[PDB]
Amino acid sequence: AKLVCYFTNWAQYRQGEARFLPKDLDPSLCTHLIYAFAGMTNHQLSTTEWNDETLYQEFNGLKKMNPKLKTLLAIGGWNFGTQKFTDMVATANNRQTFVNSAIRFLRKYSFDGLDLDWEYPGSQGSPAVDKERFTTLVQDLANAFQQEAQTSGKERLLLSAAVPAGQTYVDAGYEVDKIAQNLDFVNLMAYDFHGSWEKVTGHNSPLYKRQEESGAAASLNVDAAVQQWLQKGTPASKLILGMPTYGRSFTLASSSDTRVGAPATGSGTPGPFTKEGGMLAYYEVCSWKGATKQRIQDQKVPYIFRDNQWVGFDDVESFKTKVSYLKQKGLGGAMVWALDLDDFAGFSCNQGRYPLIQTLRQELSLVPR
Numbered sequence: 001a002k003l004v005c006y007f008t009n010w011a012q013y014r015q016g017e018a019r020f021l022p023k024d025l026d027p028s029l030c031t032h033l034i035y036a037f038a039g040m041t042n043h044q045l046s047t048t049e050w051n052d053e054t055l056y057q058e059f060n061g062l063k064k065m066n067p068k069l070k071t072l073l074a075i076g077g078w079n080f081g082t083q084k085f086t087d088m089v090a091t092a093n094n095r096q097t098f099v100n101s102a103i104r105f106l107r108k109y110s111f112d113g114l115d116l117d118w119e120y121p122g123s124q125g126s127p128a129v130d131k132e133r134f135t136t137l138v139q140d141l142a143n144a145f146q147q148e149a150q151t152s153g154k155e156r157l158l159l160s161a162a163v164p165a166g167q168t169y170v171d172a173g174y175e176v177d178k179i180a181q182n183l184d185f186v187n188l189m190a191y192d193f194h195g196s197w198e199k200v201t202g203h204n205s206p207l208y209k210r211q212e213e214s215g216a217a218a219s220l221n222v223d224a225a226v227q228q229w230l231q232k233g234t235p236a237s238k239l240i241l242g243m244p245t246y247g248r249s250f251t252l253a254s255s256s257d258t259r260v261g262a263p264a265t266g267s268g269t270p271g272p273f274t275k276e277g278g279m280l281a282y283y284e285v286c287s288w289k290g291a292t293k294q295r296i297q298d299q300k301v302p303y304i305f306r307d308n309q310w311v312g313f314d315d316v317e318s319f320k321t322k323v324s325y326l327k328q329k330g331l332g333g334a335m336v337w338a339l340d341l342d343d344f345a346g347f348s349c350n351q352g353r354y355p356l357i358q359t360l361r362q363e364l365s366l367v368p369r
């Protein structure tokens, strides 16, 4: 089993106890640590924060304490958008520039692989031609990594990708059967199924459909997303089930209607540390005073409300349920977005350090023995 965990290079800017610093990294918590995010400059892999090189040294330095640990660098993310990927994959020359730059960069900074997080080929401004060009990029990287291993005698660089759960994005961008052959593993982003972009409450990451749902909505759940990727050709052993350590929040139209599917007027109030309306870290909801926690029976996940605020999130129990699910489906492990949104320092939830991610590790039987 794998436990793949994302580090984010902006968590260092949060205030107080929420500030995530190198000391908070645990070398033995996860099997694979992925650094979010690198970017691109003139079609070449590049840093995004002023101190990334310092953090790369710390991050990859964890392997001295745990030599089993593998690290990867993720390029892209939601904010990064699509234009630079589109421009880079548009020609064989630009892809070659990128691929060669990536190999050099990963070797220079001591990463074990690259995670592609283009959000997304064929969507978010990216043209339809990018579906096949993404397939080609994945193949180019896989083949070049194979060649570099042969030439250098070094252990081959890993290639993974973070991929969307929703059919609209999957069909616009992803030749699943083809890319799954060339990826070492596939990080399924089984979250952001619902959120304050929608005019009714809905859970960030429900396991199953609700009885009331129909049409496309009935596939906006973890089980449907997993089955989608498997049926379209991803080997179960390569499919890694993403898990969110955050929730999605709403302002309710009325404090008297707190149901799943209740009318909402917009994003929930920003959290005191995360300061992003519409999301909250686990540590911002686990200890919410004077609130009412509820469970969506069909969907196997909790929500919580207080006055006109409503948040769908994951807890220890829902993580356990999801690991039982992934094991039943024979998946390759779990992925988590993100280290710094769990109660990484045990300051809020009275559950110790990393209560959610330690749950994943325990349920996957990955506890350091």
Ligand SMILES: CC(=O)N[C@@H]1[C@@H](O)[C@H](O[C@@H]2O[C@H](CO)[C@@H](O)[C@H](O)[C@H]2NC(C)=O)[C@@H](CO)O[C@H]1O
Pocket: 006, 076, 077, 078, 079, 080, 117, 119, 162, 189, 192, 246, 276, 279, 337
């Ligand atoms: C999850 C993953 O592998 N990739 C995506 C992430 O980028 C995204 O997190 C969001 O990243 C933005 C930077 O690109 C941040 O500005 C934003 O705060 C952050 N959101 C959260 C809730 O952490 C995650 C989660 O939405 O999903 C993918 O879209």
